[PDB]
Amino acid sequence: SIAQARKLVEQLKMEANIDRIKVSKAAADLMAYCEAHAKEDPLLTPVPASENPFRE
Amino acid sequence: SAEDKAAVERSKMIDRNLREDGEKAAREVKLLLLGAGESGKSTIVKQMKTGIVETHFTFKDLHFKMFDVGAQRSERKKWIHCFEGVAAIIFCVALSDYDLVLEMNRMHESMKLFDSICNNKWFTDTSIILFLNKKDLFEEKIKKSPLTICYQEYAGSNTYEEAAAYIQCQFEDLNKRKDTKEIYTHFTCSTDTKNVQFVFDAVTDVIIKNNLKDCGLF
Amino acid sequence: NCCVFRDDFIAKVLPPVLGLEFIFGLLGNGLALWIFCFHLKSWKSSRIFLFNLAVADFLLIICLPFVMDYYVRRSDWKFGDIPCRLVLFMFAMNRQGSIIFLTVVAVDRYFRVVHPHHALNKISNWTAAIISCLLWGITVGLTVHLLKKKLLIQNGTANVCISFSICHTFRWHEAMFLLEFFLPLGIILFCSARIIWSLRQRQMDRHAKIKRAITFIMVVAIVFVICFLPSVVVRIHIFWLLHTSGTQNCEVYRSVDLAFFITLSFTYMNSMLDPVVYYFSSP
Amino acid sequence: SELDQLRQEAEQLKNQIRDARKACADATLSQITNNIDPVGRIQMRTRRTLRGHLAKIYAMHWGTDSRLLVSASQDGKLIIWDSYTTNKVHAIPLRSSWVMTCAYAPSGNYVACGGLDNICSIYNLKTREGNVRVSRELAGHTGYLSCCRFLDDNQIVTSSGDTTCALWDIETGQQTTTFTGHTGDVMSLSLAPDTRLFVSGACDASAKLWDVREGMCRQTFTGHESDINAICFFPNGNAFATGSDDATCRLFDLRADQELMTYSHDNIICGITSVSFSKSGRLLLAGYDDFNCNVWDALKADRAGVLAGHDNRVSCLGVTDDGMAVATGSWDSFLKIWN
Amino acid sequence: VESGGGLVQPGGSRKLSCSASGFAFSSFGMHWVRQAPEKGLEWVAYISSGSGTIYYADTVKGRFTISRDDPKNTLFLQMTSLRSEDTAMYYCVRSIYYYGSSPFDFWGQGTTLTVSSDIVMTQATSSVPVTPGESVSISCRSSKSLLHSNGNTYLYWFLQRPGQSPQLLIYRMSNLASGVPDRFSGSGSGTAFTLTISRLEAEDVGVYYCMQHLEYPLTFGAGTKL
Ligand SMILES: C[C@@]1(c2ccccc2)OC(C(=O)O)=CC1=O
């Protein structure tokens, strides 16, 4: 089991050696996608009843 | 609509084929078989005649399906809800492992498994048929070995009648709910018959209690 | 000249007792009808048979107020010369129709405890409706003959809408009163005997709530005997006086005919304890 | 005592990872998205009810054309519906009645199923002559199958209960790549929109981000308290939402490598069995053990309505690629198409 | 595959039998399209799966009788009274109907016997030069619009090579049948439909038929020889 702990240590080094970005920068990009595609969401803004394939 | 009305009558031939095969499964009794690996499930399986093994046998014009999940080796709490709805649980415990160890003796690990299954949140009205196999070798073992090894608090003669009865009442103690379910304990030898009939009687008591639930008496 | 009379003691007993049943009946069977149609999420075979038991009882409860006005008018059917046949027809429709749906429930319970693996316990809701529809059909076959014959005999100035007059004749309606009780008692009692015995031989009584279920299989048999036997026995006595020492001087008929009229009040009782014992008692 | 030195090294290394993640926590999604107006109350009505199953329903999957869907139930049947007209295109009888997963190929010619038999069976819907028949039985797993997803018409990725996710080769039938690193049973997975990475929630209260080609774990996310029952991927592909057994939904960020928001209410104690996003990613539909389905505002962590139409636990949930419908299977053997 | 049938007879009666072979016959609706010795194809009868709906042509409404037997995989056609018009070659056609199905996919070999309102399809073009290597377009017209409320126009394109049974190229407006090369394409508008071939080959020589599937008394379109 000596190598078993080595595998956990070896893989944990890769997780630490990763590139990270500020949460605010990720928050802005995530919020931008919702607004850019808010007009293509039938659930958010109901389409006219003629366009519903399930209503009629 | 000519090729659309023809697509509806195919959806109706499929509909009736699901009811024909759905009524067949209603006339079948599903049993869940548990154990501790070497407890003796293989011996019981032959008596009534990787993954989950389904065993089919019939008795008195009644069809039984018996599933074994002792080869899963995973978290029980994740897939145990799939079996919620079985008629009864056939629990197999070997009386000849009261002193053998895997640490912890093999009989205590069966009690821990029994406690979780008996007091599970999914098995409320499911009757438990507890079988105590290996009765032949258990009688000889207590002559040269004391039962105090497994149960220190035990205090009695090393007789088969006293030792076997003490073990049986120890298992029914673990049932925290003494009014919502019943445990049909039994003693099984290596070369014995009428074991299937005992399961038939314990299942009939579940069918009667199920029938009274439909009408309203229950 | 079959003897039909009245007594003031009837007016001081029947009008007060009958109104009490209707108040209890309207709240009892009326409320239970609400649950069956708008609260029961699944309708199996046994709940179909039980539902018709309330329909027959409700058909009998709704006819109670007309009967109440009958006595307060000093036994005078003030209105409804032709409806006198109609009221007397549907009134006896329900009483015999309630018995048939009391034996079927007891027979159905017998097939669920004594033959657990029988195929009669898994009949679909459709087959339960066909049998129930036929059972309603055979009810009129023993009752519809009321409409054919002429009723509402006139006592000079008063009129009586009575079908159970004390007159020694081999009327088909006359003898049916005896078959409507003895034959069901030869089935309901026997069916409840095996249920309360097979549940004891198999040791299922203890260590369960089944004790409550066995109690109700015997409470039902008590209610049926209590509400129907007193009416039958007083009628058989009238036959004894009709066959011997009667049909000429019917002064002795005053006590039995009045008792028969009063003992008939026990029949309406069965329509009242049915929701208490059959529906609300069960979970 | 090399183990003691190795164990101490991992703890020291883990502290650096936690410090790095917290160093980038400049703000929060709730603080950043305060300005945006709420989406308002959402009313969803059952536009269709699909009937025909005679047992509990454990899985479902919409087709890529947003019209056909496949539902798996423990009565032994795999039914393919026509959601527009409630028709039944196919009814596939399974060899094993213990099925806990289902899938629909992006091409539409294949469906898959698996369960307690540790076997993922591929069914050919093309049926050049006749009916749907088994095309392959991908055996090799040690535990029960919990989720399976079609990468393409020849590659399927499966997560089993033996703490291993696998990548298969349908044409040949062998384990192309095996993913290891979990300690508990893997309960769900979700493929990326571009089909190069996939996440996998496990019973050890952690979700990992794998690489399909290389076959090595990349990032591990923690923060839950109990088993992760279900997981879903954001439409953008840089975030994913998980639902655990302690009645909470958590949204993680791939680039930030830390939890962003949590969707918890003190009135809910029932676990979560399914999660899914809308087409734009604004909504977050989740199924619960309390027989109800809740709709959450992803950018504001505010409940926006409930979908209460089931009489038993909700087990599966999905949103069409068209984004114009939501289907919610449950344990009462009913499927409902909402709006 | 499927084959089998009767022979010639003078003004009497005969039975037609077709034997299925390994394609799950119990779930396929079968037709009995027939073709005159020199004229085009013509629908005769149809029996659905499980012997449900049964339809007949206008001229064979009473004289003919259809039946099927899922055991032994055999399809039966009973003909009682035969005139001089009913002498032709009889084909057996299978067809399965679901959302994405392709009806009329397989046609039987066909047998011949001699005895010694509706929607009409125009298909005005009747002869085209046999010059290969170029693009040839085949047009067709319908009496009434074939476009339905659901949104798909029911029009099928068949190719009959000289000597063999007809083959299905395009089912519905544009969907291409399996096993058909990508040079065939179909565009339409509901009343006018066209078939386009990109690169004509030696295997494309034959007579191309059209067919409607909107109303069940369906009719073909007299073909177009290349
Ligand atoms: C009390 C009575 C009745 C019924 C309706 C109207 C008037 C009288 O009910 C019967 C009967 O049980 O059939 C016989 C009657 O004399």
Numbering used by the authors:
A (entry chain C): 8 to 63
B (entry chain A): 6 to 54, 182 to 234, 239 to 354
C (entry chain R): 17 to 299
D (entry chain B): 2 to 340
E (entry chain S): 5 to 120, 136 to 245
Sentences from the paper on this structure:
The hydroxycarboxylic acid receptor (HCA) family consists of the typical metabolism-sensing receptors present in humans and belongs to the class A GPCRs. Here, we present cryo-EM structures of human HCA2-Gi and HCA3-Gi signaling complexes binding with multiple compounds bound. Agonists were revealed to form a salt bridge with arginine, which is conserved in the HCA family, to activate these receptors. Extracellular regions of the receptors form a lid-like structure that covers the ligand-binding pocket.
HCA3 (GPR109b) exists only in hominids, including humans. For a deeper understanding of HCAs, we also analyze the structure of the human HCA3-Gi complex with acifran. First, in the structure of the HCA3-Gi complex, we identified the difference in the acifran binding position. Similar to the acifran-bound HCA2 structure, Y284 and R111 form a polar interaction with the carboxylic group of acifran. In addition, the aromatic ring of acifran is surrounded by a hydrophobic pocket formed by V832.60, Y862.64, W93ECL1, L1043.29, F1073.32, and I178ECL2. Indeed, mutations of Y284A, R111A, and W93A retained their expression levels, but completely abolished receptor activity, and Y86A and F107A reduced the potency and efficacy. We then compared the binding pose of acifran in HCA2 and HCA3 and found that while the binding positions of acifran were almost identical, the binding poses were slightly different. The amino acids with the most notable difference in the ligand binding pocket of HCA3 are V832.60 (L83 in HCA2), Y862.64 (N86), S91ECL1 (W91), and V1033.28 (M103). On the other hand, in HCA3, pocket I cannot stably hold the aromatic ring of acifran due to the larger volume, consistent with a 10-fold decrease in affinity.
